[PDB]
Amino acid sequence: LTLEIPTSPLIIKITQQERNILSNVGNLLVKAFGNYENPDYIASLHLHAFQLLPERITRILSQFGSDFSAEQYGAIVFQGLIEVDQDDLGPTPPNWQGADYGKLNKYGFICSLLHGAVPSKPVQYYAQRKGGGLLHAVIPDEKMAATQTGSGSKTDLFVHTEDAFLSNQADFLSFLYLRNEERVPSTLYSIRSHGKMNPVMKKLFEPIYQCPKDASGPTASVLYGNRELPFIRFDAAEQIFNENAGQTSEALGNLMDFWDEAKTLINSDYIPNSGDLIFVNNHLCAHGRSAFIAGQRIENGEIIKCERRQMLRMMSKTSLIHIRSVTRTDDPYFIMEEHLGKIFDLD
Ligand SMILES: [Cl-]
Ligand SMILES: [Re]
């Protein structure tokens, strides 16, 4: 049997009945636990995930969690997972700090159940907004328009796996789109799109690459895990297109050769709609976002002003045990890692 190389993510069209189930379950959890960060909820998360999710989602996510095969892209698009009432959501705040988590509470429950069904445990990183909770609102901030962050817009967000500078980077990611009126394409890149292991990829197993943290450094491997069907930690903007990356001549050459091959495999075909969720295996699939002017789209050579882009990000880890040396004593879900093993030294 010849291998069918994955070039695009799996598309799941969520039904109205599934959407109704998710909504009621979300409301029931809100009443039962108050919020998705409730320790009683988090402790029994997987029980809630398998008992409350529409069964087809549970089967999809369970299959996905343990699938690192040649055929696995490492991303799923859940089309119309939720119905977003745009007027109730109201205008997009100036930045992420102004997000109404009282209004997003139900969405946090829904997202945590999806991670719970992998099974995987939502976590937070001190490296990202000093934790900032299990659910992050990703909003274009006008002050950060030209930055290579989630608060950016005007510049292309090059494909990257989340937190390539951390040894304990997220295992799984979820991106829930509340609004994408600018019609910004989601860009995804899978290491599986390369097919069979080749000489360009083999050089990436060498632990000779700089993985710069954003805010002499240790080096890591870009490819790891299985030698034939590997996992990836990669950030094009931070490791390649950064004068201060400090890469060796050999490492930069290897990364350049890899990027030349990888850029032809980037998939920007999917334009998320309000209510879509993209679920990612952060060890298989990198993500990015094309450049856009927040609060507008162009149709028929005319500018259509619109509400600014709003997406919700949640990250999870399949094992609390393996990350225990980098988590808070009183919170095994709070990762204090700063850079490839080094922990933040706070006073
Ligand atoms: Cl992001
Ligand atoms: Re990201």
Swiss-Prot record:
Essential cofactor(s): Fe(2+)
Free-text comment on the cofactor: Binds 1 Fe(2+) ion per subunit.
Binding residue positions for Fe cation: 160, 162, 287
Enzyme class: oxidoreductase
Described purpose of this protein according to its UniProt entry: Alpha-ketoglutarate-dependent dioxygenase that in vitro catalyzes the regio- and stereoselective hydroxylation of L-lysine, leading to (4R)-4-hydroxy-L-lysine.
Recorded family membership: Belongs to the clavaminate synthase family.
The protein's name in its UniProt record: L-lysine 4-hydroxylase
The organism of origin for this protein: Flavobacterium sp. (strain CF136)
